[PDB]
Design a protein around this nucleic acid. Structure first.
Ligand SMILES: Nc1nc2c(ncn2[C@@H]2O[C@H](COP(=O)(O)OP(=O)(O)OP(=O)(O)O)[C@@H](O)[C@H]2O)c(=O)[nH]1
Ligand SMILES: [Mg+2]
Ligand SMILES: [Mg+2]
Ligand SMILES: [Mg+2]
Ligand SMILES: [Mg+2]
Ligand SMILES: [Mg+2]
Ligand SMILES: [Mg+2]
Ligand SMILES: [Mg+2]
Ligand SMILES: [Mg+2]
Ligand SMILES: [Mg+2]
Ligand SMILES: [Mg+2]
Ligand SMILES: [Mg+2]
Ligand SMILES: [Mg+2]
Ligand SMILES: [Mg+2]
Ligand SMILES: [Mg+2]
Ligand SMILES: [Mg+2]
Ligand SMILES: [Mg+2]
Ligand SMILES: [Mg+2]
Ligand SMILES: [Mg+2]
Ligand SMILES: [Mg+2]
Ligand SMILES: [Mg+2]
Ligand SMILES: [Mg+2]
Ligand SMILES: [Mg+2]
Ligand SMILES: [Mg+2]
Ligand SMILES: [Mg+2]
Ligand SMILES: [Mg+2]
Ligand SMILES: [Mg+2]
Ligand SMILES: [Mg+2]
Ligand SMILES: [Mg+2]
Ligand SMILES: [Mg+2]
Ligand SMILES: [Mg+2]
Ligand SMILES: [Mg+2]
Ligand SMILES: [Mg+2]
Ligand SMILES: [Mg+2]
Ligand SMILES: [Mg+2]
Ligand SMILES: [Mg+2]
Ligand SMILES: [Mg+2]
Ligand SMILES: [Mg+2]
Ligand SMILES: [Mg+2]
Ligand SMILES: [Mg+2]
Ligand SMILES: [Mg+2]
Ligand SMILES: [Zn+2]
Lengths: 227, 19, 108
RNA sequence: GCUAAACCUAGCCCCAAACCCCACCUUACUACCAGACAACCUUAGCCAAACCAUUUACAUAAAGUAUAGGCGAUAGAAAUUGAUGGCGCAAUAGAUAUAGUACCGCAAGGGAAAGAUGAAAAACCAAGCAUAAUAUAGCAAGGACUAACCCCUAUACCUUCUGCAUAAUGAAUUAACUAGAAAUAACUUUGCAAGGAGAGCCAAAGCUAAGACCCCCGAAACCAGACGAGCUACCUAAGAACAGCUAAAAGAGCACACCCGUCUAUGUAGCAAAAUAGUGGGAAGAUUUAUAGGUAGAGGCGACAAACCUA
RNA sequence: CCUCCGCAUAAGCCUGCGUCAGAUACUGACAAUUAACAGCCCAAUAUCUACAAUCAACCAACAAGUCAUUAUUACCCUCACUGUCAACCCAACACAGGCAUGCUCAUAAGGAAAGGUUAAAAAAAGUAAAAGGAACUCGGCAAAUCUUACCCCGCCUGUUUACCAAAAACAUCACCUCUAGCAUCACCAGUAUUAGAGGCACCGCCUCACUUGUUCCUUAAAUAGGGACCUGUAUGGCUCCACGAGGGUUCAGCUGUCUCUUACUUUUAACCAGUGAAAUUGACCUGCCCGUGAAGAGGCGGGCAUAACACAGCAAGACGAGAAGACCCUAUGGAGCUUUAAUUUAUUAAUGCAAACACCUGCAUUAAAAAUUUCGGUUGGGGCGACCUCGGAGCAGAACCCAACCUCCGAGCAGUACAUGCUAAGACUUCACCAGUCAAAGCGAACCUCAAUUGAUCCA
C-alpha cells in the first residue's frame, strides 16, 4: 500500500491538525484492528504532556494562565489552553480547572512537602503522601503517559528512598524516580463513565464499527518498578 | 447448489462476413 | 414442445405445394378503356388515377400559392381555369386557380 | 440448374551446417529541475506405490551391474572402454499465423477464418432444393409381378445387458478430420555353427539378423507463478444530494427525488444471463452517491448470509 | 397524442444521420470543434494559523467541524500548449436495464403507443356488473375499501444469502466476562472513566418457566385462535411500552376471490405485405382395441379402421424438449468443515542448556497455530444391528467338490515326554499360489494325545 502516517508534523502548535482515519488498517493496508472505521471527522490538537517544559531561554518553576477549557474529540478528558510567557500549549485539564486559573509547574523538590493545589505540576518527591495525581511520567522527563483518561486519578502511596510509589487507576503499583513530574488532582470530565450512548448511530459517529456477527463458543500483579 | 452455465458467445467474424 | 423427428421433404412438399397455399389466378383483371393499361374491375385504373393525382397535385400547389399560409381556406367556391380560358358568368364569384397548361381532354 | 464442387503454392515441419531524424520507465512512445529505492533466498504438486504418510526417473560398453529403497513401487552409478537434404505436409494438413492481426477479457491471458482464371484482363459430382406435392397399409425393403402400389415375409442401427423394437444411450444429414506406440521370452525365415556377433554379450546348438507384439476423448481435483478491489465486502482522502407537510435540535411521522426490493401478475432463448407493471420499506441518516486510493486467494473483506471478491 | 423527460457540465466513447457521389443509420471523398469556458501553476528558508457550519443574529448543542499569514532574501524584460464534433457511454444489439451533478417541476425543450385488415378461441392489461359479500382459498393471494381487537418472535432505527429465503437470523444502545501498566506506521499521535477480544441483547422485576389431562370464550360447525386450572420436567427466567412489507387469529367494511360468470376496450391473436430465429430432429409411407414383450406398443400377434391433402384450436400419448438426475448407492474419485482420527512442529510464543560475553545462532521441551492424509468390506438398496480366521455335523443319504445375513456345535489351548534327533524313496493336498499333510528305506537311538488349538514378507 501507499499509507503514510498523518503524524508528520514536527513543530508543536495550537492549531487543530487535520487527521486521517485508519479504519483499523496497518500501513500494509490490511485490517489490524477490527471495529474501527468512519465517524465524524476530527482535528488533532497537539497536547504537551511534559507539563514542566520551561520556555526557550527560560528555566526554573513557572506559572501559566488557563485561557479556556475545551472539549477534545480525540480524548475522553477535555483539554485546556494554558499560556505562559510568550507561548501557549494544550494540556490535560483537571476536574476543577476553570478559565483564568493560574497553574504552577515546578521542578523543585523541597525538603518539606509543597501545599498541593489542584492543577499544578510538581515533582512526585515534593507531593504529600496520599495526594491524587494524574499525568504521571514513567521516567524523569519522559512525559506523562499514565492517568490521562477522564476522571482517572492515581494515589501517591509512599516516597521510600529517592523513589515514589504510585497506585494507578487500575490499582497496580508503580515505582518511579521521585524527580518525575505529575499533576495534582484528578483528570477532568469525571462523569465520562456515566455517559449513555443511547443509539448505535452514536457509536458509529464516534467511529466504532459494529462487532462481527460470527458466533463464538486474580491476584494483583507485582509492582512495576522503573528504578 | 445453484448450477449456472454462462452463455458462450460465438466469434463475431462468422456472422460479420460479407460478400 | 419440440419436433420429435425431422419432417421429410416429401411431407414438406405435400404441405407447401397444396392448392390452398398456391397463389390463386385472378379473373377480375381487365383493360382500361381509356389508356389501355390493365386494371381490376372494382379498382380504379392505376395509370388514370396517377394522371388525376398529378394534376390534382399541381392544382393544389397553385391553391397553396394563392392562399399563402396555413388557416387560409377560402369561404367561396373554387374554379380551375387553364390557359386560354376566361371565367364564365357562372364562375363569377369563385376564386380562380390558373394552371399554366392547356385544358386536359379528360378534365372537363 | 442453383447452391455449390474441385485445383497448387502461399508457406510450414524435421535435420545438417553455421554461433547470434524525433518520442518513449510521468498516464510509455510526453523537449527542459535537489536524487537516494534499488537484485540474489531449497520449487511444489499432480502422478506411481492400485489408498497414503518415507519414497516416485527429468556415443557404445561395463549395466540395468555394484548400491539405494514403507529393501516396495521404484531409483541407480563409478572404476574401466573409447567417440549433406527429406519412402515430411500441401489451405480442416503443415507453425496459431494471410496474424499474435481481427475478435474476446479490466488484466494476466485466450485467439481465429481464409486464396485458387488465364501467356496476356492494355483479351458432370456431397448434402439441400428445383425441374416434378400427394392415394388405403404400416423400419418403407425383399420375394415378386405384365403392372409403382395393391399380394405374402420382415420388431432400424450402435453401445450396454442375463435379456433391447424397446417407451435404455448416441445419432438431422453431407464433406473433411478423428483413435493399438513396445520390451522379455517364444514362433517363422535366413547366415554361420561348438561357436555366433563389426570389441562389450551369449553359448551344454548356440548365436547373429529380420518378421510379428500392447488405443482415443472426458472429470471434479492438487501445486507453482502471474493477473485482478472500474462489479462487489470493508476502509482512506476530499466532495455532492436529500421537495413539500406535521413536528421540533428526533438513528421522529406522512411523503417527492433518490436507495432498496415485501407481495402479486407478466416474462422464462425474456426488454433483461434477474427485467417490466402495480404494490411496498427507508427516504436528515448506522442514509444515498460521484471521484481517486487501499486490503489478493494457506488471502482479502464480512452488522456470519460459509455473504462478496469482474455474470 | 405523449412527455418518463429535456438542455448543459462531469465521466465515458472517439467522428459514429454535416455536404457530395455511389451503391446495394452502408461505402468513398470533402469539410469540421478557433478561448474568454476548463485543464495545464506557485523561488527559498524559518515563522504564524484555540474561538465551526447552520440567513450567524438570538438560542441550541454534540458527532467538535474545508477555507487565515508574517520576517528576510531572490524576482518581469514576454497571454504558449491542450479539450471543444455527434443521434454518443457500461450492458455481445437502435437492449423496456445501469449512469454523478446544475437548471427547467412541465416545459419555450424532446418525442410517436397503431405496417394494412378482421374483431375467432386461448393468453396478458384494464373498465363495468343484478342478488349475495370470503360461502374462494393453505392463506382475503389478487382486487376493492381505509378498516377493530389480540397472540408468538424480535426491544426499537438498521444489516443479510447481487440472481428462489429480508426473517424469529446478524447487528443494536444497555449489561456482563476476559486480557493489557504502555509511546514514534494500526491500536494511537491514545494511556484503566483507556484499548482490544468476546457473550447477551433497551429499560424494569426477580434469580419461576415448559410438559400430562380437564374446562371456558370464540364459530352453526374449529386438528385454527385465545384464557384458565390440573400432573411431572428443567444469575438466566419473567415483564410487549413503542416498533415490524416478520408468523398466526379476528370485528366491521369492501369488493368478481367465489355462488357464477358475463359485456366491452387495448395488447396478443387470425389474414395480407416485408424481414426472419430457437431448442429438437436415427429413418419414417408416423391409426384404434385386446394380447404379447426389456414387464406401460404407431411399428410385434389377432381383429377393426383406412382416398389425398391443407388452415385454426387442444394438450391425453410420443415413457415429449431442456439440462451425461440435485434424491439414493458405488468409486481404495474429490473437496469444505469439526475433532480427544494418524503423522509432524517446518512457523511463531515461551522457557531450559549450550555459544557469546540483553540480541543473534544451535539443540531440546511445552503451547498456539496450523499443514498432509484417511475415514475397511459383506449386506435382499444403503443405514443400524451382526459378521470377517480355523475345525466337526446336516443341507451335500453312496468317489471328490459344493452357497447361503442357512441350521447346530465348537478353537485361538492344554497335557505328556525331551531322539518332540538327522536324513530320505514315493504320495496326498481344502479346487490357483502361498501354506498344509502322510511316509518306506538309511544313520543315530531306545528294546507324541487332541478336529481346529494359528499369522507370510519386510523389519526388530
Ligand atoms: N541437410 C541439409 N543440407 C542443407 C541445408 N541447407 C543447405 N544444405 C546443403 O548445403 C550444401 C550447400 O548449399 P548451397 O546453397 O548449394 O551452397 P552454399 O550457399 O555455399 O551453402 P552454405 O555454405 O551451407 O550456406 C548443399 O549440399 C545443400 O543441400 C539444410 O537445411 N539441411
Ligand atoms: Mg454474536
Ligand atoms: Mg497413488
Ligand atoms: Mg490406476
Ligand atoms: Mg564412466
Ligand atoms: Mg491452418
Ligand atoms: Mg445433389
Ligand atoms: Mg431408443
Ligand atoms: Mg444408461
Ligand atoms: Mg437425442
Ligand atoms: Mg472502489
Ligand atoms: Mg425533507
Ligand atoms: Mg426517519
Ligand atoms: Mg449462520
Ligand atoms: Mg450453513
Ligand atoms: Mg446482456
Ligand atoms: Mg409506432
Ligand atoms: Mg399489427
Ligand atoms: Mg357484483
Ligand atoms: Mg372458507
Ligand atoms: Mg369478515
Ligand atoms: Mg372450500
Ligand atoms: Mg393484497
Ligand atoms: Mg427487529
Ligand atoms: Mg426495519
Ligand atoms: Mg454491510
Ligand atoms: Mg436471494
Ligand atoms: Mg443487498
Ligand atoms: Mg426476496
Ligand atoms: Mg439476535
Ligand atoms: Mg380459516
Ligand atoms: Mg407473413
Ligand atoms: Mg400394450
Ligand atoms: Mg394441427
Ligand atoms: Mg399451448
Ligand atoms: Mg416410438
Ligand atoms: Mg424427457
Ligand atoms: Mg448420470
Ligand atoms: Mg447427497
Ligand atoms: Mg481417496
Ligand atoms: Mg491342489
Ligand atoms: Zn387507364
Amino acid at each position: 500500500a501507499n499509507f503514510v502516517s498523518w503524524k508528520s508534523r514536527t513543530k508543536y502548535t495550537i492549531t487543530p491538525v487535520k487527521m486521517r482515519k485508519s479504519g483499523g488498517r496497518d500501513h500494509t493496508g490490511r485490517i489490524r484492528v477490527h471495529g474501527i472505521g468512519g465517524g465524524h471527522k476530527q482535528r488533532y490538537r497537539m497536547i504537551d504532556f511534559l507539563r514542566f517544559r520551561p520556555e526557550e531561554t527560560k528555566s526554573g518553576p513557572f506559572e501559566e494562565k488557563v485561557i479556556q477549557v475545551r472539549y477534545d474529540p480525540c480524548r475522553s478528558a477535555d483539554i485546556a489552553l494554558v499560556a505562559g510567557g510568550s507561548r501557549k500549549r494544550w494540556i490535560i485539564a483537571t476536574e476543577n480547572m476553570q478559565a483564568g486559573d493560574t497553574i504552577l509547574n515546578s521542578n523543585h523538590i523541597g525538603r518539606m512537602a509543597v501545599a498541593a493545589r489542584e492543577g499544578d505540576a510538581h515533582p512526585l518527591g515534593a507531593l504529600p503522601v496520599g495526594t491524587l495525581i494524574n499525568n504521571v511520567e514513567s521516567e524523569p522527563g519522559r512525559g506523562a503517559q499514565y492517568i490521562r483518561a477522564a476522571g482517572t486519578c492515581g494515589v501517591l502511596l509512599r516516597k521510600v528512598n529517592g523513589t515514589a510509589i504510585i497506585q494507578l487507576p487500575s490499582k497496580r503499583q508503580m515505582q518511579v524516580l521521585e524527580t518525575c513530574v505529575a499533576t495534582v488532582g484528578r483528570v477532568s470530565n469525571v462523569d465520562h463513565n456515566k455517559r449513555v450512548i443511547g443509539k448505535a448511530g452514536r457509536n458509529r459517529w464516534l467511529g466504532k464499527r459494529p462487532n462481527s456477527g460470527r458466533w463464538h463458543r486474580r491476584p494483583l500483579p507485582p509492582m512495576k518498578s522503573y528504578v | 447448489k445453484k448450477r449456472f452455465t454462462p452463455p458462450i458467445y460465438q466469434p463475431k467474424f462468422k456472422t460479420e462476413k460479407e460478400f | 414442445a419440440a419436433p420429435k423427428n425431422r419432417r421429410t421433404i416429401e411431407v414438406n412438399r405435400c404441405r407447401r405445394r397444396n392448392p390452398q397455399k398456391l397463389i390463386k389466378v385472378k379473373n377480375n383483371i381487365d383493360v382500361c378503356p381509356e389508356c389501355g393499361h390493365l386494371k381490376q374491375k372494382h379498382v380504379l385504373c392505376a395509370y388514370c388515377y396517377e394522371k388525376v393525382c398529378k394534376e390534382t397535385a399541381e392544382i393544389r400547389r397553385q391553391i397553396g400559392k394563392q392562399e399563402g399560409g396555413p388557416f387560409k381556406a377560402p369561404t367561396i367556391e373554387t374554379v380551375v381555369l387553364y390557359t386560354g380560358e376566361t371565367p364564365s358568368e357562372q364562375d363569377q364569384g369563385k376564386r380562380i386557380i390558373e394552371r399554366d397548361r392547356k385544358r386536359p381532354s379528360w378534365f372537363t
